[PDB]
Amino acid sequence: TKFLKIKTVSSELSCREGQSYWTGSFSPKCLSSRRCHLVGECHVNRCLSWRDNE
């Protein structure tokens, strides 16, 4: 006579995850760089209409 014991811990209700993402705290670090007008790339039109990807 041999048994196949299947011990039961407890009755739990696990949650079914789906859409997940990671998040956290951050801190921006700005840099200052002032250049006079008509020197290299210091212009009025180039400063007002500037692209973030460039």
Partner: protein, 107 residues
């Protein structure tokens, strides 16, 4: 649901002897839990003790070792005054053993 996919199970015929002793009984009857029984199995070798009642509805299999160890499982009953006599056998020859204990009513 337990599904088997061709699993070979072997067994070695043990020939050791062990004398079981009753300890206590605390639990319930006709409930989901059951009744925890305490047994004192005293053998001289590492084997497996097999026990059963009279009609063949209850079966107790406990690991037998070298020395005096306190083992036991959870049994189910439908009477608060349990007076069923068990027949334990360590290798084939059964021995008389009577158990007792007061149970409580719980679902």
């Amino acid at each position: 649901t337990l599904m088997f996919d061709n699993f070979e199970v072997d067994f070695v015929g043990a020939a050791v002897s062990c004398d079981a002793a009753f300890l206590n009984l605390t639990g319930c009857y006709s409930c989901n839990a059951g009744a925890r029984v305490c047994l004192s199995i005293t053998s001289t070798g590492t084997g497996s003790l097999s026990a059963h009642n009279k009609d063949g509805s209850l079966h107790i299999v406990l690991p037998s070792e070298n020395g005096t160890k306190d083992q036991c499982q959870i049994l189910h009953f439908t009477v608060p005054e349990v007076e069923e006599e068990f027949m334990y056998s360590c290798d084939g020859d059964e021995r008389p053993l009577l158990v007792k204990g007061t149970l409580i009513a719980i679902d």
